[PDB]
């Protein structure tokens, strides 16, 4: 196996979202200027940043490379269809 032609990007070694640093499970974060992605090491396959492939280790004021963006969790794909569904159906009893 031999890798073919390449393409350069911009990086940062960690992600701080809620005052805590986030480190990638495999790969390291890249971006093209607008929004960030996590990628494999030997093939450009961008993926959205999610809790499933990021682990937290301490707060984000101990290492020089920190950038600001959002990190996702696999529950708001569910809870936004669940908690908002639960919250909306309970508002029709307070009206009368």
């Amino acid at each position: 196996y031999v890798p073919a032609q390449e393409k350069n990007f911009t990086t940062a070694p960690a992600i701080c979202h809620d005052g805590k640093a986030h480190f990638p499970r495999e790969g390291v974060f890249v971006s093209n200027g607008t929004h960030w992605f996590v990628t494999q090491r030997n093939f450009y396959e961008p993926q959205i940043i999610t809790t499933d492939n990021t682990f937290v280790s301490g707060n984000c004021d101990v290492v020089i490379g920190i950038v600001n963006n959002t990190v996702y969790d696999p529950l708001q794909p569910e809870l936004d269809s669940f908690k908002e569904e639960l919250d909306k159906y309970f508002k029709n009893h307070t009206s009368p």
Binding site: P3, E6, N8, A21, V63, I64
Partner: protein, 100 residues
Amino acid sequence: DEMIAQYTSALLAGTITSGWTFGAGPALQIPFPMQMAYRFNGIGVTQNVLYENQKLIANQFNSAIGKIQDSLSSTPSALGKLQDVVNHNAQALNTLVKQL
């Protein structure tokens, strides 16, 4: 001894900037503070041992290199493996010129 010193000044210029990727085709740039986080990951300890302790790890690396400088100049018995290469050859010819 000049172009030999240029070959071994190109291995150090690729293992610092590109890492290990220039031994398998195209050479890919990588920061050195991030390449070190991949050498720890291949041992068994996670990435956060380096980034959370980037200060004292840097000082241990610089001081260890400076201790090498005094260790080589402490004695002349450290380079005995290379001296026996030229000593075995030089005394092999002196025995040959006294066979006459």
